[PDB]
Structure 1
Amino acid sequence: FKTKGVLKKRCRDCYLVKRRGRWFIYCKTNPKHKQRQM
C-alpha cells in the first residue's frame, strides 16, 4: 500500500472502495496502484 492524502486512479482498472471508514484504491492488474487515505 501507499498512505496518501488524495486518491487518484493511475489506471482504468483501479476501483474505489470504502472499508474500515477509509477509502482504498484497490487494483488487480497492477498491485503497485494500491493506495490508502490517511
Structure 2
Amino acid sequence: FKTKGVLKKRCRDCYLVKRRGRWFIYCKTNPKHKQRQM
C-alpha cells in the first residue's frame, strides 16, 4: 500500500471502495496502485 492524502486513479482499472471507515484504491492488474487514505 501507499498512505496518501488524496486518492487518484493511476489506471482505468482502479476502483474505489470504502472499508473500515477509509477509502482504499484497490487495483487488480497493477498492485503498485494500491493507495490508502490517512
Class of the TM-score when normalised by the shorter of the 2 chains? over 0.9
Show structure 1 runs of 5+ residues with no match.
none
Displacement of 1:25: 0.1
User: Which 4+ stretches in 1 moved above 3 angstroms?
Assistant: none
User: With structure 2 as the length reference, what TM-score do the two structures score?
Assistant: 1.00
In the other structure, the counterpart of 1:14 is 14
User: With structure 1 as the length reference, what TM-score do the two structures score?
Assistant: 1.00
Paired with 1:16 and 1:36, the residues of 2 have a C-alpha distance of 10
Q: Deviations over 1:1-38 (max 9, x none)?
A: 00000000000000000000000000000000000000
In the other structure, the counterpart of 2:23 is 23
Kindly report the root-mean-square deviation, in angstroms, between the aligned alpha carbons of the 2 structures: 0.1
- Identical-pair percentage: 100
